Design a protein around this ligand. Structure first.
Ligand SMILES: *[B]([O])([O])[C]([C][C]([C])[C])[N]C(=O)[C]([C]C1=[C][C]=[C][C]=[C]1)[N]C(=O)C1=[C]N=[C][C]=N1
Ligand SMILES: *[B]([O])([O])[C]([C][C]([C])[C])[N]C(=O)[C]([C]C1=[C][C]=[C][C]=[C]1)[N]C(=O)C1=[C]N=[C][C]=N1
Ligand SMILES: *[B]([O])([O])[C]([C][C]([C])[C])[N]C(=O)[C]([C]C1=[C][C]=[C][C]=[C]1)[N]C(=O)C1=[C]N=[C][C]=N1
Ligand SMILES: *[B]([O])([O])[C]([C][C]([C])[C])[N]C(=O)[C]([C]C1=[C][C]=[C][C]=[C]1)[N]C(=O)C1=[C]N=[C][C]=N1
Ligand SMILES: [Cl-]
Ligand SMILES: [Cl-]
Ligand SMILES: [Mg+2]
Ligand SMILES: [Mg+2]
Ligand SMILES: [Mg+2]
Ligand SMILES: [Mg+2]
Ligand SMILES: [Mg+2]
Lengths: 226, 211, 196, 195, 222, 204, 233, 195, 196
């Protein structure tokens, strides 16, 4: 997994690859690692997939209720605090490694959070197995006062470094841009540099190739009238 | 793996399955678990394939040298003992080999069981490998010394089928051999998939399975 | 990690490196280990980042509630709340914390809380993996009632050496000055402190 | 304990269970009946860890007997087997699981059909024409696969069962001291006193 | 504690035709989650119209190939420049592998070429030296992904003739070199998609009576 | 020892043109011993189909649990549950046992009754959703199934063509797995008709 | 079987149009203690080869002596020792590879990861890796330890495949190597600011640069970072 | 292997040894003779780890046969037992010891006396009126302690031996498939073919 | 153990504490860790007392035989003999040795040989458990070409601090001065160096 977060002039951008693995096998080639906690607070997750989704949905649910209770738009520091206290309580057993970003009435924010509950602040961050390849790119090309366009480029380039160089990462690049005073734009499959080439042959079989013993209609309808 | 061999009126039958596994993965559908040592000697294979192949092909070297020095063919008893002595040298070193040495010599048909511990047992009937318990069931209830070559061949064949069906690490195909005083005779490769259905219909067995 | 807190004439100064490591990988090179639990009561954190953050957050909550009821808490009181958490949860925590604060009555005070959860009031304190390499230097060079400028130089030189020899320490040297005048943050970059 | 076998024929279910009980290196008993009648037309044989087996069996027996009295009605073999399975599936994730494998032989009076259910200690249920637990199946299933028909009589079922026990007695290293055989049919449960 | 073994990934595939044989393998070399090389040759021409690949622990693989190439050289010296037949090479390799029975070469090895009647031949070995002639064999990391596909598309397993419904099997018609190469490329393209250690490049060595020819194809680099 | 490979078994699902297919083997074993050749691993709740691989006691338990929950859903909602909604229910139910999980590999397949859109999904033992467009695989021969599906599959296959593709994917994967086989079933699912076919295969 | 005591971190390298570049820092670490600050881990062999070594320093010094002896031995009864029969990079590597694999086979390894960089007689670039297991591989870019995870991605952006080598100049290649060394200093806890760099060119020969430093570092943004979440002061 | 018994009566030594051989969970043979004739009036039965038993027995046999030919003379049972003991005491401190327990039954032609020696794999030798190895003695010694006299006939010795085997067959969990019985007396060694 | 060797204008000075411990028990409080392997080639010993004695005895034998054949050996040569023993027997040894010597041609030289058996030529070297606490102090205070009196003070102050913080170090501070003038032994007692 390669996930990154990059701050810029008027907001923040996060990105991620789309590969999920169990051992050396790829389970999903186009998996979605960018999560919506609230409309303008999104987080990318690495580690155990069920945990990143579950912890994100739970805090996102409680954030929504909090927003309704307070008549205010949710803050990134609230999601950050709720996530870290939840993860700390489970002493690292909930394997969620997240990059949390968003815009709120206070401004734009970018944080990382580890499974044991520690949080970090930064202008650029990376997590996952490909975080070293991505951070190498970020440390080489990052600068203060980036534009929106420059930050998206930097973020996707950082993910690509993970895609090509880390076996735990691959396939496509997902991006989400959170700019101040605007709707957050979720760019699913922003880049698609790993389309499979055409196969040499068609493996469509002649009808009747497979040997059959019995046939039967399955009743999926309810009990009928009359 | 399921192997069996039994003495009877007209020599000895040898039957083996053909499956090879690496964990749950079936690595080979068609392995040859019988080695033709000489025209009158056979050896079955169960355990580590490398050990079975190496030490039984090395046995054939030693049996050939016996024939050249003495001008006479080696007995089944002597051949089985040479092999059991090889195992005794690597006693404890981790070899894994279970085999039956089948043949015909001056005393008539001969059958010896040999394993990696150095064990050497003479007998009328043996079976080795993960599926040997299933084969023994069919063998013990149907075996007679009065068997014909045709019926004996079928018994060994049917016994491997029984094991191939129930044992997950046995299957693929059945290799049959019939050892006589004029030498061993190969009776073909028999796919278990095709054999199962054939036997089910003709014999009426395996009623529990739908076909 | 290389952290220290030093009392001087006008109050107390906290100092720290900015390195966070996962084995040999530097997970954060610009970490802020100087943490505020009250206006003029700060702490230096070493050990588990998760543990020391969780502790400091709980302490900040306790002192905020203390303040609402009883007014400004003493540095000793803050150290006691840290201690209570570190001592009672010693089996499950890995936290080495230095507590430093400025009162007008008591002036600058420093309390160190090592792994076991014991408390030790000292003129100055050093902690973290990198502190081992500067026990000799700090003992030889520390004086009581130093000036602000002297104390800054003492911490800068001390942490410079701790960073030089300790692989788990590095980055920038952060400092926080606590006096009657207020709270001042200082930062010193590699090109400055490496040539010392 | 060791050996339990089951076979469902045309009009009945036959259960065969070993008689031996061993403590340490000594065989304490050679006439132990490893079975409990759950209802007039439902019999359960059992095998597993010492103590747990009888404890579990008697607990199931008490529950089915309680149901019978409450409703004045006998549960179907299928219903009983599902209740038993749930108790074992419940048990496997407990602090200390009950290490018990069972066969449930019953005659369904509604459908007029014999039924044999095999359930292991994990709560793994399967309906079978013949079944076994532990190593018993390794020796006996090849014979059953060969000789079994669904239209067999009770007498033919007993003869095939004798052949299975003979094979076990020949190729098993352990002396299980023979088997007690019981038949479950429309008339209820009875024991074959000569086997 | 020192672990003398390692895993360099990679996957290999041998297919025997009627009068030809192919031995293919990907060119990616790895440790854990890192790529060492995108192009590190794994299939080698060993002389006498024999090709070889030792897949698994690369150090043991290189050592075995090096020793076999050496065995071919000394076979010429000792037996009047006689050509080493594929069956003789196979038996020789068994003894090279079994010499380290108690400290094995950690590799799955395949050789390919032509038998003495000019027909295509593939031999397959386990790490300790068991071997056997085969028509079709995939080895290495993605071996379990590829073999079932080859059972279906090379030996027509579970395929029957339409209309008969399971009564008549699909007849085992022979495959051309162009047809085999298609199945090889699709096998590796599929393996690359679902196996992280497979990718970068595919190198195929084709053996005929005319000699040994090479073909290279790009694979996905992620 | 490994709970996910004691009993053995496989499940595979595929999408086609206005159709889906889901298939499974029929084996239940105790490691090397084959116990049953009639242990079906595919269940259905209305028009939503669920295949489950792994530990057999949990397969049975989860089927009974989802029957329980879908029957209540229907009584309250006054309609049958849809594949997308059921997928979330499976995920929620598995994650509630995060630290004491069911050792299973579930697979959902069906067609949304309102949109008519084909749908498949796979899960790990603890609820992570894999919502694939092409195919989902599960079980002891999942590596084999991935290889078969990835080469044999092509999009927009007609129901009778999809049947051949999924059948050959299952059969040849099972024949390279010691713990799978002993029969096989294939469900072909269209918006308002479902056909079930038992396949003839080798019984070893 | 042993454990490494005094250790050296990453060695990084890449090919360019007319030759190869290799670099490694001057640190000898003793666990987390940065014990020795003047350790040369690039060792030239003649005027056509540089061997870069990471891992155990005591074993490095042993290998250094083997190479020094190899030069002495090659000159014996060899009138063309400084010409046609001089040591080639391929000879030096194969020798080391033989030694490494033999030592692992006796369960007593040299606890190192080695990169042999050089230029052959015919002008061809040589760049190959070998380690304590006897594992060998070649690539347009090669790196050991942390360099493999952080340097290779950066260097592969310059030379992604074989066809990019002729398009890459010595200025571009050295720039990439120097940047990679800065990145490793930011992120590797067992690295130092001081390093050595060697260029072996088919035209200009061997250029060995000592006492290089990581420069142009970005640290200013650290002043704005406060707390770990909610803290504002 | 499992069971070996020995009893010295008035004018002979009787050895009884089990017939079973087990590999894994399967009994491969039920007619195995766990004994070797060392000399015309000396018999050795054996039990222990697989392979080692026969290997050791045949090695001892070869050595005694070599001695017999060299000297044209039969060694006394005492002399043979001491040679065997030394080989086992030598073996226990070897790289891989031979895990074999033996009974040596012999008739001394010089003294006109039967003699039974029990030797375990450590090289622990004792001369006894009756003996056993492994768990065999736990079941049988109480019967032998009660019924044994030194003036017993061979027929009485066989009857007491039958009682021992019956007790074993009742209380042992393992099926050892009966015993082969051999008698050693002044006329040599003979096998009792019906037991 | 706290040991060090320091080169200066007129040659080299070796320094050491005198404590030998078995756990927390001080088995010898007046140990001599400064060992002679040749007239003007000495060594400082740390680690196993048995190992370092056995090594030093073998080295002394080697250099005595070298001298009988080839004349006075260099300090580098002595360090190489130490290295050969420490490197080749690394699996079975626990020895941290500093080799120091005076030639007329090469003057004062110092070679440190840590656990692995690597060799490092340095202007000065520190080793032993107590050395950790004076890396900062020694790095800040060492200068090249110091006088005899300055070098003695540097070692005295350095080992004083190492002894202060390290429980495995203590007793007297022994020193050996190696110059053209000859070999001088020095000793400094607790009452002297503790008040520094
Ligand atoms: B990435 O590698 O961190 C990635 C991020 C995730 C949010 C999609 N993680 C995974 O792919 C994990 C790796 C893993 C394997 C084994 C244990 C823990 C983590 N995979 C899964 O969570 C996974 C695996 N198989 C099916 C479903 N999910
Ligand atoms: B049989 O199962 O004993 C068989 C006999 C052998 C001659 C082919 N052995 C194997 O299948 C073994 C695994 C095994 C399974 C069950 C019991 C014992 C052993 N496999 C191999 O020998 C082997 C060798 N190379 C590759 C794959 N498998
Ligand atoms: B310092 O090294 O003590 C430092 C202080 C912390 C408050 C930022 N701790 C860490 O870097 C620890 C590891 C450690 C190193 C040395 C001594 C003790 C502990 N790291 C973490 O807590 C950590 C690392 N990566 C991610 C999350 N947390
Ligand atoms: B010093 O502590 O390294 C010292 C130097 C030695 C040459 C006199 N070593 C010891 O005191 C060692 C134990 C030790 C302590 C600290 C680090 C390493 C080793 N003690 C002994 O060797 C010893 C103790 N008691 C009796 C005999 N030997
Ligand atoms: Cl922190
Ligand atoms: Cl000493
Ligand atoms: Mg540092
Ligand atoms: Mg069951
Ligand atoms: Mg791939
Ligand atoms: Mg089978
Ligand atoms: Mg002290």
């Amino acid at each position: 997994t390669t996930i990154v977060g990059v701050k810029f002039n008027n907001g923040v951008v996060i990105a991620a690859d789309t590969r999920s693995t169990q051992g050396p096998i790829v389970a999903d080639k186009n998996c979605a690692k960018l999560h919506r906690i609230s409309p303008k607070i999104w987080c990318a997750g690495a580690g155990t997939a069920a945990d990143t989704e579950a912890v994100t949905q739970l805090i996102g649910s409680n954030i929504e209720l909090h927003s309704l209770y307070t008549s205010r738009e949710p803050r990134v520091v609230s999601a950050l605090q709720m996530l870290k206290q939840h993860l700390f309580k489970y002493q690292g057993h909930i394997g969620a490694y997240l990059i949390v970003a968003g815009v709120d009435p206070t401004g734009s924010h970018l944080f990382s959070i580890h499974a044991h509950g520690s949080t970090d602040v930064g202008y650029y961050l990376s997590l996952g197995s490909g975080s070293l390849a991505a951070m190498a790119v970020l440390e080489s090309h990052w600068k203060q006062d980036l534009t929106k366009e420059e930050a998206i480029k930097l973020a996707s380039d950082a993910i690509q470094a993970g895609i090509w160089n880390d076996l735990g990462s691959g396939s496509n690049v997902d991006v989400c841009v959170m700019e101040i005073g605007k709707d957050a734009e979720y760019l699913r499959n922003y880049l698609t540099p790993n389309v499979r080439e055409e196969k040499q042959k068609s493996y469509k079989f002649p009808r009747g190739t497979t040997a059959v013993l019995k046939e039967s209609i399955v009743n999926i309808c309810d009990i009928q009238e009359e | 793996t399921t192997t069996l061999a039994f003495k009877f009126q007209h020599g000895v039958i040898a039957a083996v399955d053909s499956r090879a596994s690496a964990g749950s993965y079936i690595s080979a559908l068609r392995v040859n678990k019988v080695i033709e040592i000489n025209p009158y000697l056979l050896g079955t294979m169960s355990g580590c394939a490398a050990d079975c192949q190496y030490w039984e092909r090395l046995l054939a070297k030693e049996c050939r040298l016996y024939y050249l020095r003495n001008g006479e063919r080696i007995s089944v008893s002597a051949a089985s003992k040479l092999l059991s002595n090889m195992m005794c040298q690597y006693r404890g070193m981790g070899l894994s080999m279970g085999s039956m040495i089948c043949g015909w010599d001056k005393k008539g048909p001969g059958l010896y069981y040999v394993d990696e511990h150095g064990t050497r047992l003479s007998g009328n009937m043996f079976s080795t490998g993960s599926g040997n318990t299933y084969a023994y069931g069919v063998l013990d209830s149907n075996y007679k010394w009065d068997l014909s070559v045709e019926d004996a061949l079928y018994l060994g064949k049917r016994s491997i089928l029984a094991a191939a069906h129930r044992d997950a690490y046995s299957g693929g195909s059945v290799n049959l051999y019939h050892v006589t005083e004029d030498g061993w005779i190969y009776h073909g490769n028999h796919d278990v998939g095709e054999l199962f259905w054939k036997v089910k219909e003709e014999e009426g067995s395996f009623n529990n399975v739908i076909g | 990690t290389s952290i220290m807190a030093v009392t001087f004439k006008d109050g107390v100064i906290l100092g720290a490196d900015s390195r966070t490591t996962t084995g040999a990988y530097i997970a954060n090179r610009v970490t802020d280990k100087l943490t505020r639990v009250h206006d003029k009561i700060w702490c230096c954190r070493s050990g588990s980042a998760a543990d020391t953050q969780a502790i400091a957050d709980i302490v900040q909550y306790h002192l905020e509630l203390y303040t609402s009821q009883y007014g400004t808490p003493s540095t000793e009181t803050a150290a006691s709340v840290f201690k209570e958490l570190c001592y009672e949860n010693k089996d499950n925590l890995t936290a080495g914390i230095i507590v430093a604060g400025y009162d007008d009555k008591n002036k600058g005070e420093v309390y160190t809380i090592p792994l076991g959860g014991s408390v030790h009031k000292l003129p100055y304190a050093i902690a973290g993996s990198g502190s081992t390499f500067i026990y000799g230097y700090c003992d030889k060079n520390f004086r009581e009632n130093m000036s602000k400028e002297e104390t800054v130089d003492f911490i800068k030189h001390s942490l410079s050496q701790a960073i030089k020899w300790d692989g788990s320490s590095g980055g920038v040297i952060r400092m926080v000055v606590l006096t009657a005048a207020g709270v001042e943050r200082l930062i010193f970059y590699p090109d400055e402190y490496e040539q010392l | 304990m060791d050996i339990i076998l089951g076979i469902r024929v045309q009009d009945s279910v036959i259960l065969a269970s070993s008689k031996a009980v061993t403590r340490g290196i000594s065989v304490l008993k050679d006439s132990d009946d490893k079975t409990r009648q759950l209802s007039p037309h439902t019999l359960m044989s059992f095998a597993g860890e010492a103590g747990d087996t009888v404890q579990f069996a008697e607990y199931i027996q008490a529950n089915i007997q309680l149901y019978s009295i409450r409703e004045d009605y006998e549960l179907s073999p299928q219903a009983v087997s599902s209740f038993v399975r749930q108790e074992l599936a419940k048990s496997i994730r407990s602090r200390r699981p009950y290490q018990v494998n069972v066969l449930i032989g019953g005659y369904d009076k509604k459908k007029n059909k014999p039924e044999l259910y095999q359930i292991d200690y994990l709560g793994t249920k399967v309906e079978l024409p013949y079944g076994a637990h532990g190593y018993s199946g390794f020796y006996t299933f090849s014979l059953l696969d060969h000789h079994y028909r669904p239209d067999m009589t009770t007498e033919e079922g007993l003869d095939l069962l004798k052949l299975c026990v003979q094979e076990l007695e020949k190729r098993m290293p352990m002396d299980f001291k023979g088997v007690i055989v019981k038949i479950v049919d429309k008339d209820g449960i009875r024991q074959v006193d000569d086997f | 504690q020192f672990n003398p073994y390692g895993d360099n990934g990679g996957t290999i595939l041998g297919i025997a035709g009627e009068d030809f044989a192919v031995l293919a393998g990907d060119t990616r070399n790895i440790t854990d989650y890192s790529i060492n090389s995108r192009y590190e040759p794994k299939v080698f021409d060993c002389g006498d119209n024999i090709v070889m690949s030792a897949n698994g622990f690369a150090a043991d693989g290189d050592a075995l190939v090096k020793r076999f190439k050496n065995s071919v050289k000394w076979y010429h010296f000792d037996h009047n420049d006689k050509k080493l037949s594929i069956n003789s090479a196979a038996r020789n390799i068994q003894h090279l592998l079994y010499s380290r029975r108690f400290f094995p070469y950690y590799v799955y090895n395949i050789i390919a070429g032509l038998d003495e009647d000019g027909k295509g031949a593939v031999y397959s070995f386990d790490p300790v030296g068991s071997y056997q002639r085969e028509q079709c064999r995939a080895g290495g990391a993605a071996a379990s992904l590829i073999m079932p596909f080859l059972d279906n598309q090379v030996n027509f397993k579970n395929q029957y003739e339409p209309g008969t419904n399971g009564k008549v099997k699909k007849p085992l018609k022979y495959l051309s070199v162009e047809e085999v190469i298609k199945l090889v490329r699709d096998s590796f393209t599929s393996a690359t998609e679902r196996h992280i250690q497979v990718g970068d490049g595919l190198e195929i060595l084709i053996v005929t009576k005319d000699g040994v020819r090479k073909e290279f194809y790009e694979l996905k680099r992620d | 020892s490994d709970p996910s490979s004691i009993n053995g078994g496989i499940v595979v699902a595929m999408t086609g043109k206005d159709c889906v297919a889901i298939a499974c083997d029929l084996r239940l074993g105790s490691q090397s011993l084959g116990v049953s050749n009639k242990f079906e691993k595919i269940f259905h709740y209305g028009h939503v189909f669920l295949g489950i691989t792994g530990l057999a006691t949990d397969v049975t338990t989860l089927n009974e649990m989802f029957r329980y929950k879908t029957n209540l859903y229907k009584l309250k909602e006054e309609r049958a549950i849809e594949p997308e909604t059921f997928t979330q229910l499976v995920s929620s139910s598995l994650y509630e046992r995060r630290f004491g999980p069911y050792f299973v590999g579930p697979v959902v397949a069906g067609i949304n009754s309102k949109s008519g859109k084909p749908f498949i999904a796979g899960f790990d033992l603890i609820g992570c959703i894999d919502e694939a467009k092409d195919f989902i695989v599960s079980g002891t021969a999942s590596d084999q199934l991935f290889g078969m599906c990835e080469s044999l599959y092509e999009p927009n296959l007609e129901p009778e063509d999809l049947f051949e593709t999924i059948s050959q994917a299952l059969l040849n994967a099972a024949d390279r797995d010691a713990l799978s086989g002993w029969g096989a079933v294939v469900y072909i699912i269209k918006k308002d008709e479902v056909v079930k076919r038992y396949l003839k295969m080798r019984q070893d | 079987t042993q454990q490494p005591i005094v250790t050296g971190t990453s060695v990084i390298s890449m090919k360019y149009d007319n030759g190869v570049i290799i670099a490694a820092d001057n640190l000898g670490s003793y666990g987390s203690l940065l014990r020795f600050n003047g350790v040369e881990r690039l060792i030239p062999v003649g005027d056509n080869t540089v061997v870069g070594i990471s891992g155990d320093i005591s074993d490095m010094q042993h290998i250094e002596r083997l190479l020094k002896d190899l030069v002495t031995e090659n000159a014996y009864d060899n009138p063309l020792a400084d010409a046609e029969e001089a040591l080639e990079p391929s000879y030096i590597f194969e020798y080391l590879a033989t030694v490494m694999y033999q030592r692992r086979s006796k369960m007593n390894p040299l606890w190192n990861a080695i990169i042999v960089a050089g230029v052959q007689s015919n002008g061809d670039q040589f760049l190959r890796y070998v380690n304590l297991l006897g594992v060998t591989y070649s690539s347009p870019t090669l790196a050991t330890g942390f360099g493999a995870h952080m340097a290779n991605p950066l260097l592969r952006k310059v030379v992604d495949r074989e066809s990019d080598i002729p398009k890459t100049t010595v200025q571009v290649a050295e720039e990439a190597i120097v940047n990679a060394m800065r990145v490793l200093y930011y992120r590797d806890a067992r690295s130092s600011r001081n390093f050595s760099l060697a260029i072996i060119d088919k035209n200009t020969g061997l250029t060995f640069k000592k006492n290089l430093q990581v420069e142009n570092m970005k640290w200013d943004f650290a002043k704005d970072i406060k707390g770990y979440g909610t803290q504002k002061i």
